[PDB]
Design a protein around this ligand. Structure first.
Ligand SMILES: Nc1ncnc2c1ncn2[C@@H]1O[C@H](COP(=O)(O)OP(=O)(O)OP(=O)(O)O)[C@@H](O)[C@H]1O
Ligand SMILES: Nc1ncnc2c1ncn2[C@@H]1O[C@H](COP(=O)(O)OP(=O)(O)OP(=O)(O)O)[C@@H](O)[C@H]1O
Ligand SMILES: [Mg+2]
Ligand SMILES: [Zn+2]
Ligand SMILES: [Zn+2]
Lengths: 437, 302, 662
DNA sequence: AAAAAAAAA
């Protein structure tokens, strides 16, 4: 049993230490540059793994949840080999390294997932709708007995353990153990909700939601309302607290995330795109090359496109030592005859902007835009839930059929757009909330 | 290896779909061809969802037993001429490339990359494309080959989309001596200003025509439009025997008399043509001058 | 072993359930069933099940549909055995179906290991009120509506256990989807102890359970509905949708319950229905033309007939004349309805521009013009139809609505009327009287083809691809021919411009027209009188004879043709005159508001293109020809010119005659 | 117990 684990670890270590293209060992230099900046992680591409040897990829695709931890401990073994000196014999504050994967396999829609995808590596795309608060998880537990009163340590992996029966060798109880919270190691976990993309929904149906779990460095990376591409494991976890017989609610374990925005919005750009942007800014007719690029499928409108460009760039925010604020956005209203292509510009403006939301003024309400005061049925406590004008903070909000909007609903936006802050007082909750859009 | 379009770089479904020989043998331009293809896939036993995945992530067991699957299944449909022997080159951990795939990538990179004045600009663009293709040869560059492969896929898609429309419209007029078809109007016709692209389209058309029950071997004339210059680009095409034929009826390859016909017509009549291409069977003719010329070619001894 | 069919007539055991499983008779049943589905001949003399198996192999689906009356006319005893003991017969019939499928496709097991069978139409139909103790463990056919759908979760199919007191691995065990496996002595060691699942070697199914109420159209008036629970196994997941009336054939079974016994104080048992076949029955109540789970599905021979009859000259005229064969006149209305229910082609430019591909139609005219009958026929023939009327529909009822789930207690989305109209037609009657707040909520549905909701902390956009057909009445109850359309109705330009084809019907006085209409109505009334081999097929030929006298083609063939044309054929638009259409649009921009009141915008050019594409679709052609464009432009010009005052109608008619010469 | 959406007066 242990021989196979050692063989697999040796295979992965040989892959890490022997893979080279031309005159560079890419993964060793990656480990060096990661350790220097304190990012204990490594990224593996599927194509390299398949090209090196096919048996390792076959074993990884067969039973992923059992094989991945062996790779993630081989990584830290190699890191300790190539980062510290034996010195003929310390801190050693190197936890188990995180493994991140990338792939280019065929995508699978959410509704296509079924019983044959259990315990398999799948790639899929969706939209993030809500992010849970981070919670703690135990990795290295220091455990103390009560009667014999000795010390023991438990190492816990996150993939796929209870109090040991009897004591370690007089006549203790079944489980006479307690948890020593000090001298224990903890990590972070987060929950996310994913929704099907609108264009892939089947005929006459409604979007379906799914639950994902991320941990360590993968947490706090996405924000609600951003299209993402996820690679992970589709497994099932039972619900003892929670219909039917032998039921098992499925979920996703996140291994890798790709996003279009790349979490750019301080500067995360490298030198090549920076100099490309500077050279583009040196174009002496950039104004026209941008005006022509705003919906090239719409003919005739030019001042509208110039106004849209000016709105997209946005003003310059200003503050004063006296404490007063000055607005830094411009608001454009289109008020004209039918057939002049007003909504087709609204959807394109929604598409171009990095953060944007498109909603109708008819199917909307005052409480459904700024902040809705929901109440958790379980713990029976009040909490604020974001609407639509808080999701579009730092971006642009697309409203059409503005006149069809109710008079009582149309008044809540006054302060929200003239001061860029919303104040709420409901059920004892007194919170001023910022919304700049 | 097999007569397949980028087997190791595209899915097996697309490989069967875009293959010229498979198209000719199964008539994929109408719905019965797709029904026969689905019957083929079901009888072989590869799932439709499995066959639509990349060759890298395609199932290892099926990739291993593909040879036996093909050997046992292709006989009924009569595609047993698709299997042949080819050369494969591997360098380290990069991957595997076949000679056919590499030459298709090179051809497509030549095709796409990057009055008299516009013709000169087109010719200098062509020589620049040649230099870029030449640079792509060395082993130190692979982003100049992946791009070529994806451009080959795109160009084959465009050629298929135009050929299906041609076969729908039945533009192939059957004259007494030689078949004729003219691409008067349509989409993406600017791509066909390249003689090599026109030859690719003509090769697919002549394969489709040969893979029929007709017992007439007639030369085919294909023409296009370049609205900026208002000139027709006319290329003569030789007939081809079916690939699954013995050597006894191969006493001499089919010759091409189009160059002789064009030169004789131009030397006996003051037509406004420009015969300068190294291929003597490709000429540029005027829109107003095409027809009279055509009747002349009909009346002249070919 | 006398494996003869006649020996199955008399039972030797006490019950069917313990007799069928006998080894001697089970193989006889298997071989007889094989001889049945390998040799059954239809009216044409060909094995229909062979074509069914071929199509199943093409589509690599899970369900093979076997018709009940086919098994009833020949080999009735097997049908009776299936009707009385379904669970014990479906297993053998699945085995023989798998053998038959592998006969055509060797090594098909790699695609799928097991095959599931479906029963098409049982003879007897019950309701939810009429359920007793006698019909337990037997096939039932129940019609109802879907109220709450739980979702999709996996289940264990082949359960195995590892007992660690003796190191004993239990064999593969089955699960009945409502009972837990319970083992007492734990195999040879004959002792009970700790055990584990060890699920590394197991197979999974997926289920879905739903609540079934009574249809309001069959409940006694003023009473309360009855609820049951329906369990859906694999290949039946997500087939049913909330709010959709369905008919389910299944098996009736009972199980113990503790709280139910506690509350009633008597040994009462709960009852559930496990589905075996589902048939949607929304809108299309006409269910007598043909049998089967679906009436919009075609065989290979029907596709061949479609292709054979789609090439004849003047098929457009036959299609138009074969629609509503019991309504006299109104050729323009029939043409508009055909062009609206055939639809166009949605366009996506570079994934960044969207062009709608469905046609809206507005009807207007005097009373007694049979607009509602046309609407009823449209609802009958369409695949997905939703009927709304007058003030009985609200703004939030047509679009999506937000609702707080009473169980989990959070806001959720409820599908509206327009959502059910995706890939279909939404029909509205008495469009004029509907209140403006109830009328302004479908602008996006007409034009943007999308519904956006930002309510109660939910920000979602819902796609809607629906065609709207509306009927209304002018001011005063009659159309004043000497007034423009702006003074005839209270609707405004934003709503009027979204309708492609607008028809105005006038009721005038004509002697010979009145005589002809009276003759046609009287002959129709006489025709539909309830009083004028197998008797059923004789009734069928009588119906065919009665039908062929008013319609060029049968109705079921027309419905399957419409479905096929909407599904597969996509016309393309290359060789059309640029200048003719551009000049016609310029001419229509001229006159119009510059001389009258009817609004014309860029939407009507796209409407002309969509009508041309629809006419191309009607011929099962992939490319638009010139004749289709001529027909479309003629229709649009006629519809525009025939809605003006009587002072300028002749002048405009002779002014526009140069575009539709023909 | 308190917030927010829907049909009818
Ligand atoms: N200038 C234009 N160029 C091209 N297409 C146009 C132009 N103006 C309008 N259209 C066409 O008009 C059609 C409908 O436009 P749309 O519904 O967006 O109009 P609108 O002015 O926003 O209407 P509403 O005021 O009723 O909301 C689109 O298909 C679009 O292509
Ligand atoms: N050619 C015909 N034109 C008009 N009505 C016809 C014709 N032939 C028969 N009818 C009869 O005319 C009657 C008209 O029905 P109905 O009252 O529903 O029409 P309507 O005036 O369009 O209705 P609504 O009040 O909904 O506007 C029907 O009973 C129908 O049988
Ligand atoms: Mg609009
Ligand atoms: Zn102890
Ligand atoms: Zn035992």
């Amino acid at each position: 049993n242990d021989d196979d684990n050692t063989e697999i670890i040796k295979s992965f270590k040989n892959f890490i230490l022997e893979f080279r293209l031309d005159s560079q060992f890419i993964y060793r230099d990656q480990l060096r540059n990661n350790i220097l900046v304190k990012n204990y992680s490594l990224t593996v591409n599927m194509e390299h793994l398949i090209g090196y040897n096919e048996d390792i990829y076959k074993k990884l695709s067969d039973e992923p949840s059992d094989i991945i931890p062996l790779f993630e401990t081989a990584i830290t073994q190699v890191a300790k080999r190539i980062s510290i000196l034996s010195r003929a014999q310390l801190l050693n504050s190197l936890p188990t390294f995180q493994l991140i994967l990338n792939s280019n396999a065929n995508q699978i829609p959410l509704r296509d997932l079924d019983s044959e995808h259990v315990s398999k590596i799948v790639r899929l795309s969706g939209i993030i709708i809500s992010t849970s608060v981070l919670s703690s998880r135990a990795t290295y537990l220091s455990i103390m007995c009560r009667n014999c009163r000795h010390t023991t340590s438990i190492t816990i992996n996150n993939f796929n353990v209870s109090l040991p029966r009897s004591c370690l060798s007089k006549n203790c109880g079944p489980d006479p153990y307690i948890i020593i919270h000090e001298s224990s190691k903890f990590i972070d976990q987060q929950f996310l909700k994913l929704q099907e993309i609108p264009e892939l929904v089947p005929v006459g149906e409604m979007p379906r939601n799914l639950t994902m779990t991320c941990d360590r460095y993968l947490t706090n990376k996405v924000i609600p309302g951003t299209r993402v591409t996820i690679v992970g494991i589709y497994s099932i976890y039972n619900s003892k607290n929670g219909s039917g017989v032998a039921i098992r609610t499925p979920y996703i374990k996140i291994l890798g995330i790709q996003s279009d925005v790349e979490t750019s919005s301080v500067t995360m750009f490298t030198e090549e795109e920076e100099e490309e942007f500077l050279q583009l800014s040196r174009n002496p007719k950039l104004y026209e090359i941008l005006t022509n690029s705003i919906a090239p499928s719409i003919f005739g409108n030019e001042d509208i496109k110039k106004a849209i460009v000016c709105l997209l760039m946005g003003g310059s925010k200003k503050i004063l030592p006296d404490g007063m604020r000055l607005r830094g956005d411009i608001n454009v209203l289109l008020l004209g005859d039918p057939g002049t292509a007003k909504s087709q510009l609204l959807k394109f403006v929604e598409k171009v902007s990095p953060i944007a939301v498109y909603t109708s003024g008819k199917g909307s309400s005052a409480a459904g835009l700024t902040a809705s005061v929901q109440r958790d049925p379980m713990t029976r406590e009040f909490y604020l839930e974001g609407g639509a004008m808080v999701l579009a903070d730092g971006g642009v909000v697309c409203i059409d059929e503005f006149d069809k909007m109710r008079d009582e609903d149309r008044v809540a936006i006054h302060e929200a757009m003239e001061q860029q802050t919303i104040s709420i007082a409901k059920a004892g909750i007194t919170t001023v909330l910022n919304s700049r859009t | 290896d097999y007569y397949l379009f980028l087997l190791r770089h595209s899915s097996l479904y697309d490989s069967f779909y875009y293959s010229n020989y498979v198209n000719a043998k199964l008539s994929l331009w109408n719905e019965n061809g797709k029904k026969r293809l689905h019957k083929m896939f079901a009888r072989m036993g590869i799932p439709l969802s499995t066959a639509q995945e990349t060759w890298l992530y395609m199932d290892h067991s099926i990739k291993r037993e593909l040879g036996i699957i093909f050997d046992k299944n292709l006989d009924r449909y009569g595609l047993q001429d698709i299997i042949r022997d080819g050369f494969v080159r591997t360098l380290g951990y990069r991957g595997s490339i076949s000679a056919s795939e590499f030459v298709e990538a090179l051809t497509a990179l030549l095709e796409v990359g990057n009055s008299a004045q516009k013709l000169t600009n087109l010719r200098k663009r062509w020589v620049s494309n040649f230099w870029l293709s030449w640079d792509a040869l060395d082993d130190r560059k692979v982003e100049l080959l992946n791009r070529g492969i994806q451009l080959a896929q795109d160009l084959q898609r465009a050629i298929f989309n135009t050929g299906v429309a041609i076969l729908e419209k039945k533009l192939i007029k059957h004259l007494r001596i030689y078949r004729l078809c003219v691409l008067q109007d349509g989409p993406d016709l600017d791509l066909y200003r390249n003689p090599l692209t026109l030859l690719r389209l003509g090769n697919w058309l002549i394969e489709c025509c040969a893979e029929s029950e007709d017992k007439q071997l007639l030369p085919m004339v294909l023409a296009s439009i370049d609205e900026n210059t208002d000139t027709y680009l006319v290329a003569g095409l030789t007939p081809r025997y079916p690939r699954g034929l013995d050597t006894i009826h191969t006493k001499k390859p089919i010759l091409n008399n189009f160059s002789m016909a064009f030169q004789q017509i131009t030397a006996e009549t003051d037509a406004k043509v420009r015969i300068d291409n190294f291929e003597s069977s490709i000429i540029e003719i005027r829109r107003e001058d095409l027809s009279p010329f055509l009747e002349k070619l009909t009346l002249s001894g070919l | 072993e006398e494996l003869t069919l006649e020996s199955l007539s008399n039972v030797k055991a006490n019950s069917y359930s313990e007799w069928i499983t006998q080894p001697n008779v089970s193989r006889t049943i298997a071989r007889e069933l094989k001889s049945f589905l390998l040799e059954y001949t239809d009216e044409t003399g060909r094995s229909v099940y062979g074509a069914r198996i071929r199509t199943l192999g093409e589509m690599n689906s899970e369900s093979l549909e076997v018709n009940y009356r086919h098994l009833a006319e020949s080999k009735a005893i097997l049908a009776l055995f299936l009707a009385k003991c379904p669970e014990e017969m479906l297993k053998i019939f699945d085995l023989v179906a798998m053998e038959a499928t592998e006969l055509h496709y060797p090594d098909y097991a790699r695609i799928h290991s097991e095959i599931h069978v479906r029963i098409s139409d049982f003879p007897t139909i019950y309701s939810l009120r009429e359920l007793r103790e006698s019909n337990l463990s037997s096939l039932v056919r129940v019609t109802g509506v879907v109220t709450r759908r739980t979702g999709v979760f996996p289940q264990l199919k082949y359960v195995k256990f590892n007992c660690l007191k003796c190191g004993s691995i239990l064999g593969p065990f089955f699960q009945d989807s409502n009972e837990e496996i319970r083992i007492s002595f734990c195999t040879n060691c004959k002792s009970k102890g700790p055990f584990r699942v060890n699920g590394e070697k197991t197979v999974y199914r997926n289920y879905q359970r739903v609540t079934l109420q009574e249809a309001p159209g069959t409940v006694p008036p003023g009473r309360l509905p009855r609820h049951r629970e329906v369990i859906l196994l694999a290949d039946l997941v997500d087939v049913s949708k909330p709010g959709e009336e369905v008919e389910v054939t299944g098996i009736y079974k009972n199980n113990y319950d503790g709280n139910l016994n506690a509350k009633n104080g008597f040994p009462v048992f709960a009852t559930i229905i496990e589905a075996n076949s589902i048939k949607r029955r929304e809108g299309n109540t006409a269910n007598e033309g043909e049998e089967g789970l679906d009436v919009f599905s075609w065989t290979e021979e029907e596709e061949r007939e479609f292709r054979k009859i789609s090439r004849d000259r003047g098929i457009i005229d036959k299609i138009i004349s074969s629609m509503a064969p019991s309504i006299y006149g109104h050729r323009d209305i029939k043409t508009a309805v055909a062009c609206s229910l055939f639809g166009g082609v949605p366009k996506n430019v570079n994934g960044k521009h969207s062009i709608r591909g469905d046609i809206n139609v507005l009807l207007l005219g005097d009373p007694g013009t049979a607009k509602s009958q046309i609407l009823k026929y449209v609802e009958k023939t369409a695949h997905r139809a939703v009927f709304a009327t007058g003030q009985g529909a609200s703004a939030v009822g047509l679009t999506a609505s937000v609702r707080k789930d009473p169980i989990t207690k959070e806001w959720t989305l409820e599908g509206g009327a327009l959502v059910l109209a995706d890939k279909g037609v939404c029909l509205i009657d008495e469009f004029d009287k509907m209140n403006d707040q109830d009328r302004t909520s479908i602008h996006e549905a007409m034009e943007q083809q999308s519904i956006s909701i930002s309510k109660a902390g939910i920000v979602t956009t819902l796609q809607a691809r629906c065609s709207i057909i509306a009927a209304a009445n002018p001011n005063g109850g009659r159309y004043n021919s000497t007034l423009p359309l702006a003074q005839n109705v209270s609707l405004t330009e934003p709503i009027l411009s979204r309708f492609d084809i607008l028809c105005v019907v006038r009721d005038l006085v004509d002697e010979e027209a009145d005589e002809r209409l009276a003759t046609f109505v009287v002959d129709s009334h006489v025709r539909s009188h309830p009083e004028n081999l197998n008797a059923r097929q004789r009734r069928l030929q009588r119906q065919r004879k009665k039908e062929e006298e008013i319609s060029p083609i049968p109705q079921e063939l027309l419905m399957k043709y419409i479905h096929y044309a909407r599904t597969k054929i996509y016309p393309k638009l290359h060789q059309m005159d640029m200048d003719k259409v551009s000049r016609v649009y310029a001419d229509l921009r001229r006159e119009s508001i510059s001389t009258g009141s009817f609004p014309i915008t860029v939407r009507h050019l796209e409407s002309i293109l969509r009508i041309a594409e629809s006419f191309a679709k009607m011929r099962l052609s992939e490319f638009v020809s010139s004749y289709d464009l001529d027909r479309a432009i003629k229709v649009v010009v006629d519809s525009f010119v025939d809605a003006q005052k009587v002072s300028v109608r002749r002048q405009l008619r002779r002014s526009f005659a140069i575009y539709t010469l023909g």
